[PDB]
Amino acid sequence: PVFDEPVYTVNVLENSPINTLVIDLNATDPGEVVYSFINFVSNLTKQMFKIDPKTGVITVNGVLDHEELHIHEIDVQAKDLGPNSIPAHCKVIVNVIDINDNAPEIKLLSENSEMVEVSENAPLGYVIALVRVSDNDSGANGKVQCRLQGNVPFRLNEFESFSTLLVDGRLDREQRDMYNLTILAEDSGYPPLRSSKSFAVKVTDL
Ligand SMILES: [Ca+2]
Ligand SMILES: [Ca+2]
Ligand SMILES: [Ca+2]
Ligand SMILES: [Ca+2]
């Protein structure tokens, strides 16, 4: 036998259903030849794909997760039931294509994820905390954007790779003691997924 091509590359959606076709291989024609995997660069690759020993059809066999692994290399052979008979080999590269299956995570940089205080004497601009928003997806699906909600005497400041929670108002512990702030976040995949974190700011005099 001889595979039509030496190397094949196929795209497959992440989260593809079990039994999704990946590729139908061919190393003969008009059969007694036996298609099999002989190697699996990652050992994870072994649960993700099955192949029909008779037709050489590879199908999805477990849950394909882009965030777990992007790209699979499989080595396939074809061998006739034969007393003496050499195998044909090919490589099958499976690109697992990322979809937006991950909402944005919103992280506060403080020593606690709500316990977060300030002094009313802090001026216009005092960075009280740092927020980091992440998304495990790639590309647009993973580009995130966020925004403080309600209106309140703070504001977020937009940097590449992080945001800073400032004061934007005269504070005094007497007029307003606690606050409840909400951060809303949205990624740029389709459909856009979105996430939000509500967290407390307690004010002090010192
Ligand atoms: Ca075939
Ligand atoms: Ca995933
Ligand atoms: Ca994804
Ligand atoms: Ca996402």
Numbering used by the authors: 213 to 242, 248 to 423
Quote the paper.
Protocadherin-19 (PCDH19) is a member of the non-clustered δ2-protocadherin subfamily that is located on the X-chromosome.
Root-mean-square-deviation (RMSD) among these four molecules is <2.4 Å. The EC3-4 repeats from both structures superpose well (RMSD 2.1 Å), and good quality electron density maps allowed us to unambiguously position side chains for most residues. Pcdh19 EC3-4 was refolded by overnight dialysis against 20 mM TrisHCl [pH 7.5], 150 mM NaCl, 400 mM arginine, 2 mM CaCl2, 2 mM DTT using MWCO 2000 membranes. Crystals were grown by vapor diffusion at 4°C by mixing equal volumes of protein (Pcdh19 EC3-4 = 14.4 mg/ml and Pcdh19 EC1-4 = 7.7 mg/ml) and reservoir solution (Pcdh19 EC3-4 contained 100 mM calcium acetate, 100 mM sodium cacodylate [pH 6.1], 25% MPD; Pcdh19 EC1-4 contained 200 mM sodium chloride, 100 mM TrisHCl [pH 8.1], 8% PEG 20,000). Although the Pcdh19 EC3-4 structure does not reveal any relevant interface, the Pcdh19 EC1-4 structure does. The Pcdh19 EC3-4 N317S fragment refolded well as assessed by size exclusion chromatography (SEC), but its melting temperature is considerably lower (40.7 ± 0.6°C vs. 52.4 ± 0.3°C), even in the presence of 2 mM CaCl2. These SEC and thermal stability results indicate that the EC3-4 fragment carrying the N317S mutation is folded, and may bind calcium, yet it is not as stable as the wild-type fragment.
